[PDB]
Amino acid sequence: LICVNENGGCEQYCSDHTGTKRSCRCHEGYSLLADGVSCTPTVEYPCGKIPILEKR
Amino acid sequence: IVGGKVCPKGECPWQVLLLVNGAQLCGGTLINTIWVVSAAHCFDKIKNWRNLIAVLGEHDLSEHDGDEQSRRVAQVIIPSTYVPGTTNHDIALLRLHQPVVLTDHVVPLCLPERTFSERTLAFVRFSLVSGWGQLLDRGATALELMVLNVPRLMTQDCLQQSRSPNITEYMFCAGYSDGSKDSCKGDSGGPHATHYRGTWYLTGIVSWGQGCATVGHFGVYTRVSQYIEWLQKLMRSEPRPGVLLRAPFP
Numbered sequence: 001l002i003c004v005n006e007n008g009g010c011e012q013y014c015s016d017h018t019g020t021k022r023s024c025r026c027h028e029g030y031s032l033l034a035d036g037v038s039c040t041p042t043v044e045y046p047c048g049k050i051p052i053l054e055k056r
Numbered sequence: 057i058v059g060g061k062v063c064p065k066g067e068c069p070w071q072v073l074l075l076v077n078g079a080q081l082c083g084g085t086l087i088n089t090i091w092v093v094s095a096a097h098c099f100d101k102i103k104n105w106r107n108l109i110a111v112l113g114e115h116d117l118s119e120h121d122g123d124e125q126s127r128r129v130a131q132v133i134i135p136s137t138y139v140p141g142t143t144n145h146d147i148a149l150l151r152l153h154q155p156v157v158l159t160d161h162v163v164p165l166c167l168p169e170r171t172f173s174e175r176t177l178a179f180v181r182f183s184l185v186s187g188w189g190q191l192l193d194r195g196a197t198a199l200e201l202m203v204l205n206v207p208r209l210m211t212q213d214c215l216q217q218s219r220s221p222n223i224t225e226y227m228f229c230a231g232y233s234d235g236s237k238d239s240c241k242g243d244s245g246g247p248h249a250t251h252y253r254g255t256w257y258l259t260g261i262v263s264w265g266q267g268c269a270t271v272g273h274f275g276v277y278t279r280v281s282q283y284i285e286w287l288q289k290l291m292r293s294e295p296r297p298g299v300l301l302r303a304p305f306p
């Protein structure tokens with residue numbers, strides 16, 4: 001996969017690698033799940049998320 | 057903000073209000089607990105650099121509800137390429153004297169990676185712009201934080217549809233040409249915020265335009281993707297004496 005189309009399937013950041021290799025990454029306050037694309041909050045107040053709505 | 061709506065309290069939690077001797081100066085965007093992004097032109101006429109305040113968790117300026125957090129601005133960092141009184145390179149990075157405490161009402165916006173911003177975020181059509189600026193051209197400013205959804209234009213289409221300064225590669229147009237909807241004087245320095253897969257990112261800074269909501273014209277925003285590395289490097293740097301710092305760009 002390539003980071004320029006569909007974000008390489010990544011939820012957040014994407015790095016191309018020599019080969020058909022691609023690495024997704026997550027912003028500080030998040031961790032990458034085993035699917036290798038999704039990012040999940042590791043802290044109470046991660047960037048870019050709105051707590052009143054995340055609560056609902 | 058012209059032709060938008062009140063941002064419900066807590067839903068624009070990265071919005072900053074900048075004050076100079078208690079008076080409204082400009083907006084900004086919190087990107088972590090000590091750093092705020094704003095517009096370089098906000099500081100063109102600062103006389104006493106020591107009386108700059110950033111307020112987080114602000115919503116209704118007529119009252120105090122206890123969610124607000126104010127901090128002295130310890131540093132204003134402006135790229136070397138910015139010329140006061142002009143429009144290009146309209147970005148400032150502010151260091152707060154003390155971190156804000158993250159809460160339901162105070163949360164940073166994510167500063168994206170450059171590649172992700174260029175390759176993915178730049179093609180998200182709509183993005184939110186916010187501030188306590190003028191609600192009308194030649195009008196009074198907002199007491200309640202306002203927000204507006206605006207669509208982004210490729211620069212060629214902006215120029216084609218605009219009926220000025222150049223739109224440089226350090227800028228982009230967003231909004232409407234019919235005079236209904238715009239960011240305005242007072243909103244300068246505030247966030248242009250882009251949603252992707254459940255998370256919001258900083259893509260723009262409220263910068264300039266012809267009057268507010270002027271027919272045949274679009275709002276113009278600093279293209280933040282050009283500044284990611286410049287910002288990240290400054291965030292790893294030690295503070296320097298004196299508030300204003302001009303730093304080499306690139």
Ligand SMILES: Nc1ccc2c(N)nccc2c1
Nearest residue numbers: 239241263264265267268275
């Ligand atoms: N000082 C400013 C800042 C932003 C503006 C905008 N986005 N549209 C129209 C006028 C404006 C004036």
Ligand SMILES: [Ca+2]
Nearest residue numbers: 115116119120
């Ligand atoms: Ca208040």
Ligand SMILES: [Cl-]
Nearest residue numbers: 041042043044
């Ligand atoms: Cl958590």
Ligand SMILES: [Cl-]
Nearest residue numbers: 292293294295
């Ligand atoms: Cl250093």
Ligand SMILES: [Cl-]
Nearest residue numbers: 105298299300
């Ligand atoms: Cl000083």
